[PDB]
Design a protein around this nucleic acid. Sequence first.
DNA 1: TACCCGGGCATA
DNA 2: TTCATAACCTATAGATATGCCCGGGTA
RNA 3: UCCGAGCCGGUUGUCGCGCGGUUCAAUCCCUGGUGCGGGUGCUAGUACCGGCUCCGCACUAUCUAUAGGUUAUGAA
Length: 590
Amino acid sequence: PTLHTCNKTSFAKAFLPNETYRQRLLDYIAIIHQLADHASHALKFYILSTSTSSFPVVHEDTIEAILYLLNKGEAWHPRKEAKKAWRDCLLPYVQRYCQIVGFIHPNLRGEQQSINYLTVSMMTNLKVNVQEHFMQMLLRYINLRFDVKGQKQRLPPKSDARKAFFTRLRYLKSVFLFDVVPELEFLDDLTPLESEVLEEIWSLDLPFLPNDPLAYAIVADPMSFFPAYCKLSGLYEQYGFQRFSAIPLRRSLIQSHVRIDTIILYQHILCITRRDAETVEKDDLWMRVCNLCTKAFRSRCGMHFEGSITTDGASVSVYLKHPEADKYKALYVENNLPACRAAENVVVIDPNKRDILYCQDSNGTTFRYTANQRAVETGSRRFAKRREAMKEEAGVDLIESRIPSHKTMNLMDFTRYLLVRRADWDRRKEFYSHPAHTRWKWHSFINRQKSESDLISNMRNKYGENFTVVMGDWSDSKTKGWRTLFKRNRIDCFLLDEYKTSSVCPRCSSSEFVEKKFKTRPHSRPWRRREGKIEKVHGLLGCTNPNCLQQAWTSGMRYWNRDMLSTCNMLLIVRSMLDGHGRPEVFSRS
DNA sequence: TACCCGGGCATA
DNA sequence: TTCATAACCTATAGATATGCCCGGGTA
RNA sequence: UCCGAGCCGGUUGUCGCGCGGUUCAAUCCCUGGUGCGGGUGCUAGUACCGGCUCCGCACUAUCUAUAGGUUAUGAA
Ligand SMILES: [Mg+2]
Ligand SMILES: [Mg+2]
Ligand SMILES: [Zn+2]
């Protein structure tokens, strides 16, 4: 929530030059990464193995037991009965997975904090994935079975007589989702394909709530839908449809950020006994290894360091925690008109795929922030090319390209995937252990900060010290993140509808004479260009009304830039709203 | 034999 | 039309610390 | 599979102009920015006051993991 914030700095600046502490941190994070990866893989293996009888009720205890068995094995001695039962149930499968992958127990001491963090993170990932995408995948399967993609081509489009099927589907889903209780007579009207789909959906054993819809049930207790979600994945694999990651495997070999709190310095880094450490204040203890006088550790908006960082070997994210922590169409300009009138200057912004921002003012001054500029400043393209060159030189591409899909729900296929991953684990681990990846991430962060700061500085220099931002509500290229950026710089941002803003000429206010796609040219994309394809120009528009024309023009139409027209029409709309006349009729929906 | 500290485990 | 590895956008959830028991060495 | 940004024209408020001319910005290393004092230096004319670079006071900037779409690459 609002009670927490983060400041990201370099590894060298955050920590003192004592090499022992840095080496201990680097060693600890590497062990934690492997533990998390193998825990996720073992959880998936156990789920697939138990699929023979029933999908288990996965809780925090399951992942915690998997982690402990990987780290300690039989040496784990839980006190409570539930954890002991989980240990007894998971030990054989964990040992079998270790044999398959050749895992060697690290026997790391003092793993409580890291194990708790990893268990919480993995359960959060499971919950988020299931909650967010169970409905999406179910509806996607429903559409795929009925060939809705091909049904448009099979039937003549835009015909009332053919609307029956697309209406029939709308009803079937309501029966399948338990949204509407079907009448008994309708059950006998199902065609064989519909009956098969109904049986397949029934086999999923989807939970249900009588008082609230299925969507509310998913949010209320998303994890209860996990057993069905996995089943759904299997259905895909039965029909060859594009599969999805049912279980969130943690596969990346690059060093992931690992959390470090006061306890981790307590035990692993400083290696001081708990009794001795309890006699020292937290701030001094952290100062013994960290330069808290650095800029990154300063208080902001009443927040304080409070001993919490995340490190990956190249960058350190220090978390500032407010003292009051838990400790265990509002955005549209229509509703914000009163605030707009007090702005010194008003900026109207149109987003586009290429021109990420196209900004204009009432005084006519224009500005833009394009995709190419963002790519160049951020360095994404250069880093991508260098990474591709490294992969080509090391030959890792041939190894990764042949890896069997990890989304399979069959035990044999998952075992084959694990064997293939083990076969070349050593080479890829060394390749991704290179400092290039974390350094690239840190440099990308710095470049993004620089680019955003330069953008804000240029906007202030062109449009004044303070101004209000009005942006279109279109979204697909950065689309919705900008709303946050202006907030970080204390610049107001408001939304505006783009309906037909690109089909009206501001100088005659008549949409009947607007020309679209009046010229064609060889395709801009080189691979499409060599293919012989031709592209219609989208951003160029024409006006044919005589009032906008002149006798000295042989073209016969006044030319306009699409972004310029959009910004001018949006400025006119804003002026009309501020004048009390509301949205102009021409741009109004109906 | 019995005492102590350091470390592992539980949990809001 | 299917798979794998980076990343870019969007969205979700989470962002430690104190007490109790045991085991290893010592008296 | 490639594309930096501003200005003057072909231009009329015109293009993923693979049209021309024209100005500076980055291509490695780097957490970013704002306001207040001095502290060598480098620059423009006789203490005036423009820039680059540090010192120090407070003012400020949300990261991690996972999943969906896409991009780039490598296989069919
Ligand atoms: Mg638009
Ligand atoms: Mg546009
Ligand atoms: Zn017109």
